[PDB]
């Protein structure tokens, strides 16, 4: 599952894309059930 | 802390913005320490 | 092409998701060629 | 205005973050007036 590199001009954007990236990656630390109970 | 409504034209976009929204909200279920240990 | 509604808790998030949504929608105002010349 | 580098694990994510990044950068090719007329 590839390690790819995204160049970002602008710290404001970079920090936003970073935010999004992390929160997406950090979701695998939650049980599938929690993520499901959060939706309903 | 306001409840706001974002109208989305397109299911492909909506599902992306949804994805991002959830993963951002679902991060409060993780310890601040986990989020920190994930960064380093 | 559906009009869907995304509820957002938090103005900081809403404004981010809004930003992303707009910039994605506003890209249809550019020529496909511009978007392509921007990539290369 | 810094050039920063965001490493992404996963092509699906990378392509999403790329999408967002581009559409945000590609908005400077539109007149401020267009972006404003799009909002109202």
How would you characterize the overall build of this protein?
It is classed as transcription. Keywords: tetramerization domain, cell-cycle control. It forms a tetrameric assembly. The entry is titled "Crystal structure of the human p63 tetramerization domain". Chains A, B, C, D: tumor protein 63. 4 copies of one chain form a homotetramer. Chain A is elongated, with a radius of gyration of 14 Å. The first copy, chain A, is α+β, with helices and mostly antiparallel strands and 40 residues long. Chain A starts with a strand and ends with a helix. Chain A has 2 helices and 1 strand, in the order βαα. The first copy, chain A, has one domain: p53-like tetramerisation domain (p53, subunit A, Irregular). Helix content of chain A is 57%, strand content 18%. Chains in contact: A-B, A-D, B-C, C-D. At the A-D interface, β1 and α1 of A face β1 and α1 of D. β1 of chain B pairs antiparallel with β1 of chain C.
Write the topology of this structure.
The structure is a homotetramer of 40-residue chains.
Chain A: E1 3-9, H1 11-25, H2 32-39
């Amino acid at each position: 599952d590839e390690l790819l590199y995204l160049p970002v001009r602008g710290r404001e954007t970079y920090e936003m894309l970073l935010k999004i990236k992390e929160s997406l990656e950090l979701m695998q630390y939650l049980p599938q059930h929690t993520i499901e109970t959060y939706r309903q």
